[PDB]
Amino acid sequence: MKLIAIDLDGTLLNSKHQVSLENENALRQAQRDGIEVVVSTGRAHFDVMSIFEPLGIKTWVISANGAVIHDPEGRLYHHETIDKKRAYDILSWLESENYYYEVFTGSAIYTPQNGRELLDVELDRFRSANPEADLSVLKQAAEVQYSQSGFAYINSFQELFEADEPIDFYNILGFSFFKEKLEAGWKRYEHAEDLTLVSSAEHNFELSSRKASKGQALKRLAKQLNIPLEETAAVGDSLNDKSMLEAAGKGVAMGNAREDIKSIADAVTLTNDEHGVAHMMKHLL
Ligand SMILES: [Ca+2]
């Protein structure tokens, strides 16, 4: 393998959202072996930096569900935006229908939700990745995570359009505690050919442009680095990782991965908590 793509939540991160010593060592060893390491997430580039900066970790970063790509030093390689009229349409619908939502842009993550609501969205991420984890451990970690968040409050999505300032829309996360609302959101966009529809947790769905997906971003990067897809591997646990496992020469599912992700994988590693990423590096590739 010459390139390895690694999902962030539920994969590189354990249930306390830490990068274990084992995983950090595995990442550095891979870079030491001359392997290009890429971390791929639906979150913002700055969310990844907040975790990596203190650890001195520098990898390629695919963020906003494949809408954005940065190199190890933070140089921008690509930004794939959602057409503004389509973004307006989506946000107007989400807000009018009472969905919690987060708008990933260049500057920050805009949202009208309050702290409790935003924490609920995050807790859902934690619980979906590790359903077997103690709720108290997950909540404490979710709070630490939120405390390092980079949200910007807005009264209405309208504020993101009624201003004469540049603002690009990369990924839109929609959330609802209700199964009926989640199904309605999925049905509404599952056939939209100008968009990419995925989910990163049991109670959310994410919308990015058609050409913005973890798999397409991986292909885009591999091509630029002159690395054949046959020489690339991707590992993840959640539904939004499906496209990159499919794109990679070798798709790896985390031990705590969703059943559909394990189903399409060529290999399966340990859970995120048991350092599955490190195990894959040393015992699967
Ligand atoms: Ca994940």
Swiss-Prot record:
Reported EC number(s) for this entry are 3.1.3.-
Residue positions annotated to bind Mg(2+) are D7, D9, D237, S238
Which positions bind phosphate? L8, T41, G42, K214, N240, K282, H283
Identify the InterPro entries for this entry.
Answer: Cof (IPR000150), HAD-like_sf (IPR036412), HAD-SF_hydro_IIB (IPR006379), HAD_sf (IPR023214)
Q: Which domain of life is it from?
A: Bacteria
Instruction: Tell me the keywords, alphabetical order.
Output: Hydrolase, Magnesium, Metal-binding
UniProt GO molecular function: magnesium ion binding; phosphatase activity
UniProt enzyme class: hydrolase
Cofactor needs = Mg(2+)
Any one annotated GO CC term: cytosol
Kindly identify the residues recorded as the active site.
D7 (nucleophile)
Q: What does this protein do?
A: Catalyzes the dephosphorylation of phosphorylated 5-6 carbon sugars and monophosphate nucleotides (NMP) in vitro. To a lesser extent, dephosphorylates flavin mononucleotide (FMN) in vitro.
Family as reported in the entry's similarity comment: Belongs to the HAD-like hydrolase superfamily. Cof family.
Which NCBIfam families is this protein grouped with? Cof-subfamily, HAD-SF-IIB
The protein's name: Phosphatase YwpJ
Source organism per entry reads Bacillus subtilis (strain 168)
